[PDB]
Design a binder for this molecule. Structure first.
Ligand SMILES: OC[C@H]1O[C@@H](SC[C@H](O)Cn2cc(-c3cccc(F)c3)nn2)[C@H](O)[C@@H](n2cc(-c3cccc(F)c3)nn2)[C@H]1O
Length: 138
């Protein structure tokens, strides 16, 4: 397994047709997971499954600019389960990140940070065993 938190460089940033794939297994009794597509200190796209927020499961997405979080986008469809292996696919499209989990479409997140070629790191954090993180062009 890879060391968590893990930093995957994205050389030259992201671009439409770039597909990022994360494989791992959620820990027992997991509380949270986060993917952070970063532009320097800014977080262009934070994808944050919460397993116990007031005894509810929710996916929170947001952007952090100049150290400030913006408006959250929340998805109640929650395809993760403690103890189970998962695949997250993030496909960069012209106007949004498109996310599928275990081959099922989950959500889209419109680009707030527009300099896609400057979003050149992916951080992976939280309560997982990380198997692999990689990218390819489709
Ligand atoms: O915005 C994203 C940030 O959120 C803050 S928590 C703010 C609360 O969500 C704000 N809020 C919303 C509502 C509300 C929404 C709708 C209806 C209504 F009635 C109320 N009430 N309060 C988190 O710390 C922040 N973070 C998470 C992590 C993090 C670090 C390592 C692993 C990991 F997995 C995760 N690092 N930093 C980020 O996830």
């Amino acid at each position: 397994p890879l060391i968590v938190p893990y930093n995957l460089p994205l050389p030259g940033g992201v671009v439409p047709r770039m597909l990022i794939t994360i494989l791992g297994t959620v820990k027992p009794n997991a509380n949270r997971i986060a993917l952070d597509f970063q532009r320097g200190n800014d977080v262009a796209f934070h994808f944050n499954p919460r397993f116990n927020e007031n005894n509810r499961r929710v996916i929170v997405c947001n952007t952090k600019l100049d150290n400030n979080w913006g408006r959250e986008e929340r998805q109640s469809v929650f395809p993760f389960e403690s103890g189970k292996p998962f695949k997250i696919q993030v496909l960069v499209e012209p106007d949004h990140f498109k996310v599928a989990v275990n081959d099922a479409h989950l959500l889209q997140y419109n680009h707030r940070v527009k300099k896609l070629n400057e979003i050149s790191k992916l951080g992976i954090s939280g309560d997982i065993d990380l198997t692999s993180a990689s990218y390819t062009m489709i």
